[PDB]
């Protein structure tokens, strides 16, 4: 990644085994459960495009997902190139060239060029731009592997209300890949006895009040 030293200047630092192992284990344990995405984002703080490819490459399984991610990346890179065409022809000696989609994705750029872009003034944050493309793809994957529709999350006749609400909002989080946009459907899919207590609370009950009322 790029971090600041005591100069205090922005410099490249090797990705640590600590970070590498964290990401590998998160994927191993959690697959594409939505809470994997914020972990990816935090572990890749300050990442160059090279670092981002490294993390993605250390994933052993899930190659269907990874191919879908590649397809999303290529789509975003094509759109980058539409929005910001780069001038062909030889570039000026010693000068910084403009990055195209493939440079941002780190397929056609060197680490040194990536470093140059990220630390220039003003900087071209190719690491942040590539990370956004990756998260866009990962969100699609989280939504694809979400196994259940919110419409099938209904409270069991013997299920405690809190356990039902946990399933409901966990399902909501995956179906929406942790992006916000509920109250009524939650009451509707409650079991008969809880639904009765809830309807009699009136509209605008907080979740706290609902869980209290059905405890």
């Amino acid at each position: 990644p790029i971090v600041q030293n005591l100069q205090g200047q922005m410099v490249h630092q090797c990705i640590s085994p600590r970070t590498l192992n964290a990401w590998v284990k998160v994927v191993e344990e959690k697959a594409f459960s939505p809470e994997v995405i914020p972990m990816f984002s935090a572990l890749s703080c300050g990442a160059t495009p090279q670092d981002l490819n490294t993390m993605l490459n250390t994933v052993g399984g899930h190659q269907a997902a990874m191919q879908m991610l590649k397809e999303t990346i290529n789509e975003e890179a094509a759109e980058w190139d539409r929005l910001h065409p780069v001038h062909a022809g030889p570039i000026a000696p010693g000068q910084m060239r403009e990055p195209r989609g493939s440079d941002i994705a780190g397929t056609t750029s060197t680490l040194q060029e990536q470093i140059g872009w990220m630390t220039h003034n003003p900087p071209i944050p190719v690491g942040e731009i590539y990370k956004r493309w990756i998260i866009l793809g990962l969100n699609k994957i989280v939504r694809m592997y979400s196994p259940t529709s919110i419409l099938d999350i209904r409270q069991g006749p013997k299920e405690p209300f809190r356990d039902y609400v946990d399933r409901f909002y966990k399902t909501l989080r995956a179906e929406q890949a942790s992006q916000e946009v509920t109250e009524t459907l939650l009451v509707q899919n409650a079991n008969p006895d809880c639904k009765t207590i809830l309807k009699a609370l009136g509209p605008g009950a907080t979740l706290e009040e609902m869980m209290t009322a059905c405890q």
Copy 2:
């Protein structure tokens, strides 16, 4: 988080895998037992609002609680906006804008803006302000999931006094979410033989003396 360097200046530093993993495991092992809250506070030392959202987002389960936390956060942010309205209209070029509730909660502010607020002179400590809102919500959650009333903590006929006092004050801590405001109820809920020894100690016995007397 924000830490000081050797300049020695306040600078942003990436959240470490060590911290990320600690928080994830604490929640996994302890749920919303009250001692989870001080762990959250210590692990989030120097946190930006982005860092705080990261930690909250890496929690996989407990989505009922998390939605309750969101509702508490939105309440505190609405109140912030009532107390400190921000001036609409274009802000002055190159100047720091005023944060509203959603900026403090990190929903509508960038990391760079958060950094600017936290390191300004005088600083606007948006990380500390957001952490207070979060702890307020987490305390509500700790109190909700407290499974037992202090009124049902009574010493078993064969239960050692120390084991009874452990249950009593552990229950007290959850019911009050580790916030202070006892002696008499502790004696009242003691078993017959211990209660006898305790009553004969008179008022104002220290807990030490009570546990000694019933050992």
Copy 3:
């Protein structure tokens, strides 16, 4: 905690997950065995009162002990206030105020005030003062939960002398909470055959010589 930087100046540093986890696990594994106390003291090197409360708060169980510790802390703070009354009335603008017991225990002081006291010249070491109060309380707890009197530590008819001496001095350490003030009682509680060998050594035998003689 407070540590020195390369300026090299005394600055506040966040408590590390490494330290937090160490303390939590020590208590989990060892309860209030006496060797827990020196571990507490070493893990809390350079601690502010805030850090000390953090460590104490991350303890999940043992709430009878923790309440006894609170009572000891309040006693020491009352005595601090007797010895060093603070002047009421508004304090001088921009000036350091005097800490009372509750400030030292970190109940009524901010981290910034604690930092100010600890780094002032001359410093008021509120972290060290609070740590002493805590260790005073923890020592009482170690002594309370000591399950056996030294008078009941007697060598088994088939127990090796070394195993008996281990139990004897381990019991002594708890009963005295690792504070020093023996030879004769150790011989007295030895089994018949070992006691015979020991009596014939005469007074002033070193433990080494005693263990050699009964090996």
Copy 4:
């Protein structure tokens, strides 16, 4: 490895136990699965040729592979020598000599000479050059130990489409040692019912659309 200090200058640093252990465990757990290669590359960030030999040498098993790697290294070093012959005869006192293949592979050069090359201006990046040779060899090994042809990856009659796509692209990755150059063969090797749905999608369906259509 070589890293920059606060001068901020390029200096040699000892390889850490953290890195050494990471590499050893990766090989132990994963053999020559393709995701091992990017892990090698990241763990060897900034590596001297000495560091690269160290990592390769700490591998205990897989000695057939290691001998194949040696043969690849010797081939690349022979080619280096063809392209960049070094002048025989005594070199100038105090001056940097030219590296030949065996110096780059660290068989005939000292750590001090390697350091000199890597930090000279302009530098001769012998660590990066040697790493490329090693990855070239490791890629051959990954391809050799790939147990299955893509032609034998066909969807089971009861196999979920996603599970089939995972096997297909994982096989592709090994057979090609994680180097890119598919859609049609993936449809062809699908089972009858999925193939029907897929053919009726028309050409140019994204993988996302295909997996959606066969879910």
Copy 5:
């Protein structure tokens, strides 16, 4: 411990959880096997007397040994006082006082005084002096708990020679607490067939040659 900073000056640093845990686990796993002593010495690199007491205090069991260690420490401190008597009477304002045995053992000195001695010019290395006393005691303990005499280490009729030599020199190391001062007794305690081969080698065979000859 005391380490140098970038000033680069000798400063006090808190003992790390890493070090604390290492020592605790070494004792837990290895007891007073001789290889425990060099581990103690290395883990206590740069230790103040306070740090040394900390490490000794975190040992939970083995209290017979610890009392023997205390007795050895008191003996060395008495001898220090004989060799270097300290002048009674009030010491000069602001000046460094002379350490007596109890100051070196850290029973009657503060951390600040210990720091002063260790960093003075010329320094009085109270940490190194105390460590020597401790190792002297630990060596006595290693020798006491050595369960077997070298005279009872004889090669089994079916025991491989290498396995016999391992037991022989491991026994030697404990009986001598890893202090050097053999060839003949090793041959004498060999089994009949190996002894025959060995006698016919003549005097002055290296161990290598002996183990080769009896393989």
Copy 6:
């Protein structure tokens, strides 16, 4: 070890628990398998003779090997003394003395003297010189405990060729203690069917081609 600081100067640093534990576990898990040697060399990067003795001393078992290592060390030290005799008589006040074999092995030199030699200009690298002696001894040990001759490594009638080549080169590595100096013996010890395929390849087949041909 000796490392450079930010001055940036060569200074002594305590050996870390991380390093100490790594070495101890490597020996525990791997004995004197050849890949242990490069691990020793890397873990002892920058080591003083004191550090080298520390690492060797933390090994609990294998005392036959350790005594053989001592004998090798004494041989190398005797030869050092033959090549570089040191002048007897009192050395000049404040001046650096010449190291003899026992100083390099750290038996008769202090840490301060070792530091002086290693950081002098020009330096006398006593750590590197001692490490070479140790590796020379360890290599002898690896060769001694090699359980099998390359002449007994023959392909099983049902053994896959790759599994045979793994055993062959692993045996070669131990018998030669990871020092290079094969093709023909590998074919000769192949099973009948593989030998046939191999002979018909002609001389000069690469191992890659051989393993391909017998897959």
